[PDB]
Write a protein that binds this ligand. Structure first.
Ligand SMILES: OC[C@H]1O[C@H](OC[C@H]2O[C@H](OC[C@H]3O[C@H](O)[C@@H](O)[C@@H](O)[C@@H]3O)[C@@H](O)[C@@H](O[C@H]3O[C@H](CO)[C@@H](O)[C@H](O)[C@@H]3O)[C@@H]2O)[C@@H](O)[C@@H](O)[C@@H]1O
Ligand SMILES: OC[C@H]1O[C@H](O[C@@H]2[C@H](O)[C@@H](O)O[C@H](CO)[C@H]2O)[C@@H](O)[C@@H](O)[C@@H]1O
Ligand SMILES: [Ca+2]
Ligand SMILES: [Ca+2]
Ligand SMILES: [Mn+2]
Ligand SMILES: [Mn+2]
Lengths: 240, 240
C-alpha cells in the first residue's frame, strides 16, 4: 500500500498484529518492554522489543517517491532507584530485524557490541530516550540524560538534554518530511515542559524500501520499567 | 489496533502485505484474481483470492465496541465469450480462511459445495458481483447478473439487478455503520450509472472479533478476467 495507518489508544491483551521479541509483553493495557517481577517491579538484565507486523513502504525506487510519516506515542519509566536504566527507543529497521546478540544494557536492544558504532555495519534509524550515561560503560553518551537521534550507530548524530521523571508519561511526536528530509522529534510532559531535536537524513541511503517500525528497551545492571502506553502511526508515499 | 487503514491506488509487483491464494497474482499494476494465459486472456477452471495481511479488529466483546469500516475499490471484467463467469467478491472472514476444496465456479472461491447454503456452517460476509446465473447450475441465483450481499451462504440475503460492462471499471464503496448495523453498497460506472443495495446485519453474530479482508473470484467452464485495480480500506472501533 502507498498509505498505511494504525492506532493503539491502549494495548489490550489480545493482540494479533504485534511481533514480540525478547521479554516484551502486554500487562494492564500497556506494553511492558522490559521484564518485571510478580509485583510489577523492574528487574535487571532484560531486553524487549515489539514491531508492527505489516511492512511499511518507506520509499519506492521505481517512482522516486519517499514516504512522509508520523509516529505519536506515550510512555512512562518507573524505578525504585534514582538512576533507572537504560532507555527506550522508537526504531525503523529492515523487516527481518531481531535482537542482536549482546545488545542489552546501553545498546538498547538495537546494536551488537562489536559493531555498535560502525555506521557501515548497521541499518537502523532510532529516536532514543536514554537515561543512563556513565562514561565507563556508555562511552558514546554525553554526560546527562538525553533524547537522541541514532542513524546506524549507538552514538547519536544529534542529542538534546532531557529530564527523566519517574512515573510521568512523556508524549512524543516523531515526524519525517521527505520534502525537507527533516526527522523531527517533539516530546512533552503534561505540564507543558517541551524538548525538541531534529536532524536531516536521506532515508533512502540508510534503509531498504520496505521496513518495519517498533520500539525497543533494555535494562543492564541498573533498571526501570519501560511502559509503552499508546501509539499511532501513519505513512504516505509522496512525490518530491 | 483500534483503527487501521491502508490504500492501494494501484498494485505494483513488489508486494509485501498481501496474502495470495490460488491463482491470484499481480500483473500490469493490478491484481489478476483469476489465471490468464501468456497473452493475458482468461482461461477456465481457476480460482484466486487475496487478503490483507494485518488482521482487522471488527468488534470487541470486553468493551462492547464494533467497527465502523469503509472499503472503496474498483475492478473490471473482460471476456471474449457472451457469458463471462463467474464473478468477483469483496469478503470478510476468519483470519485463517483458505480456498475451500471444490469452491470453484459459481461458488466464487468462498464456499464448499456441501455447505454452500448452510448458514450455520460458514463464517463469511461478502459482496458479490455475479455475472453467471444459469438456472441449471447456479440454482440459488436470480435469473440475471446481479450484485448480492452474502451472509454465510452463496444464496444471497439480497440481490439487485446489475449490468455487466466488458472492460469498463466499476467503482464500489462498501460501508458498515455499527450504530444502525447497516451494510451499504454503492457501485457506479463512469457514465454515472448507479446501483445501491443495503442490508441490516449484526456482524458480532456472524464473525469472530478479529478477521481478514480481501477479494475472491473464480471461473468454472465459462471465464473472464477479474481485475482488481485499486483498493482502500479503513476501520475504527466505536462504542455502540
Ligand atoms: O463457469 C460457469 C459454470 O461452470 C460450471 O458449470 C458447468 C456448466 O453447467 C451446466 O451445464 C453442465 C454441462 O452442460 C453440457 O452438458 C456441457 O456443456 C458440459 O460440458 C457442461 O458441464 C450449465 O449451467 C453450463 O452453462 C452453459 O449452459 C447453460 C444452459 O445451456 C447456459 O445458460 C450458459 O450460458 C452456458 O452456456 C455450465 O457451463 C460450474 O463450475 C458452475 O459453478 C459455473 O457457474
Ligand atoms: O544498566 C546500566 C549498565 O549496566 C552495565 O554496565 C554496568 C554499569 O556501567 C555500572 O553499573 O557499572 C558496572 C561496573 O563497571 C557496569 O558493568 C551494562 O549492561 C551497560 O550497558 C548498562 O548501561
Ligand atoms: Ca546510555
Ligand atoms: Ca452465479
Ligand atoms: Mn545515548
Ligand atoms: Mn449470485
Amino acid at each position: 500500500q502507498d498509505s498505511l495507518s494504525f492506532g493503539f489508544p491502549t494495548f489490550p491483551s489480545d493482540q494479533k498484529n504485534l511481533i514480540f521479541q525478547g521479554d516484551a509483553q502486554i500487562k494492564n493495557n500497556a506494553v511492558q518492554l522490559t521484564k518485571t517481577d510478580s509485583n510489577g517491579n523492574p528487574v535487571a538484565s532484560t531486553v524487549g522489543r515489539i514491531l508492527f507486523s505489516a511492512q511499511v513502504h518507506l520509499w519506492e525506487k521505481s517512482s522516486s517517491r519517499v514516504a512522509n510519516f508520523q509516529s505519536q506515542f506515550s510512555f512512562s519509566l518507573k524505578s525504585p532507584l534514582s538512576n533507572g536504566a537504560d532507555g527506550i527507543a522508537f526504531f525503523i529497521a529492515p523487516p527481518d530485524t531481531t535482537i542482536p546478540s549482546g545488545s542489552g544494557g546501553g545498546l538498547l536492544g538495537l546494536f551488537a557490541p562489536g559493531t555498535a558504532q560502525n555506521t557501515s555495519a548497521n541499518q537502523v534509524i532510532a529516536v532514543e530516550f536514554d537515561t543512563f550515561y556513565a562514561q565507563d560503560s556508555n562511552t558514546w553518551d554525553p554526560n546527562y540524560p538525553h533524547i537522541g537521534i541514532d542513524v546506524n550507530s549507538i552514538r547519536s548524530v544529534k542529542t538534546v538534554k532531557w529530564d527523566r521523571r519517574d512515573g510521568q508519561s512523556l508524549n512524543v511526536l516523531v515526524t519525517f518530511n521527505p520534502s525537507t528530509r527533516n526527522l523531527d522529534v517533539v516530546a512533552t510532559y503534561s505540564d507543558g515542559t517541551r524538548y525538541e531535536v531534529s536532524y536531516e537524513v536521506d532515508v533512502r541511503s540508510v534503509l531498504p524500501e520496505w521496513v518495519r517500525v517498533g520500539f525497543s528497551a533494555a535494562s543492564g545492571e541498573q533498571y526501570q520499567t519501560h511502559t509503552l502506553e499508546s501509539w499511532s502511526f501513519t505513512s504516505t508515499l509522496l512525490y518530491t
